[PDB]
Design a protein around this ligand. Structure first.
Ligand SMILES: Cc1cc(C)cc(Nc2nccc(-c3cc(C(=O)N[C@H]4CCCC[C@H]4N)n(C)n3)n2)c1
Length: 268
């Protein structure tokens, strides 16, 4: 889906920056209406071929996903840099939002992380692994509606395997022991990451494993230690984080079980 650069207007003041380049706000003219978009634009004109490949692969993943809790891609634009154009989630990354809005109620945090678990249950059912599931990569449409983005490390699993095996530069603080030790990424690896994301959410966007190097995090986890309970965090939510942080992959829940535990309404 290649878009017409002429139908896109970009604002100069970026929404965000990352090691890869910038995210800009824009407006894309559809058949009748304009749609507000967030646009990922690669740094230094997309001359870095690995960056460009990563974008195209990110676009290829997003194009295949259709779920209310996953950001929708409109398409890619090759103009002055390469650009991935996405429907805009106007409240921005969850971590920043919670840093700035410290009176969001527990029930509301549970609601948001339940939405993330519904999107991840969909990804699991679709046999994709996200591999970068962090609060910074959850976008708020409204204070009561979260979506997942940032599919740059995501992989479609082979039909005969339950994991992706890497031959990286990685968000180690969100990774399960099997990712670190064996380079194996399953949906259950994403569940571990989700436990970190829950910790972040109930800590109003604090960084996990503050002050620690990745080697120190690995050592801490191998010793059976885990981050402590955020001040004020509901006990049941901390208990669910510890279940997501089950060392043994076979006994760690999948997203179908996690999603059930985050439903705040009666069900079977
Ligand atoms: C107010 C505000 C700020 C920002 C930054 C984004 C938005 N909305 C928005 N809506 C849909 C999608 C995205 C988005 C951001 C990134 C990304 O690449 N983000 C990276 C750089 C920015 C901060 C976090 C990081 N993962 N992707 C791959 N999709 N964003 C709104």
């Amino acid at each position: 889906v290649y878009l017409d650069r002429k139908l896109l207007t970009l604002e100069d003041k970026e929404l965000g920056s990352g090691n890869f380049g910038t995210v800009k706000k824009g407006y894309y003219q559809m058949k009748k209406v304009v749609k507000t978009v967030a646009v990922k634009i690669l740094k230094n004109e997309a001359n870095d071929p690995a960056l460009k490949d990563e974008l195209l692969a990110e676009a290829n993943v997003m194009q295949q996903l259709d779920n209310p809790y996953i950001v929708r891609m409109i398409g890619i634009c090759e103009a002055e840099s390469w650009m991935l154009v996405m429907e805009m989630a106007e409240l921005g990354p969850l971590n920043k939002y919670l840093q700035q809005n410290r009176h969001v109620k527990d029930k509301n945090i549970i609601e948001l992380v339940h939405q993330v678990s519904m999107g991840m249950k969909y990804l699991e059912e679709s046999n994709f692994v996200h591999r970068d599931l962090a609060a910074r990569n959850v976008l708020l449409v409204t204070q009561h509606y979260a979506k997942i983005s940032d599919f740059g490390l995501s992989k479609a699993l082979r039909a005969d395997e339950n994991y992706y095996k890497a031959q990286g530069k990685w968000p180690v603080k969100w990774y399960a022991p099997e990712c670190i030790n064996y380079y194996k990424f399953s949906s259950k690896s994403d569940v571990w990451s989700f436990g970190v994301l829950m910790w972040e959410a109930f800590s109003y966007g604090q960084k996990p494993y503050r002050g620690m190097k990745g080697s120190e995090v690995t050592a801490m986890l191998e010793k059976g230690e885990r981050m402590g309970c955020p001040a004020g965090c509901p006990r049941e939510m901390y208990d669910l984080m510890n279940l997501c942080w089950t060392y043994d992959v076979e006994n760690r829940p999948g997203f179908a079980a996690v999603e059930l535990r985050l439903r705040n309404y009666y069900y079977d």
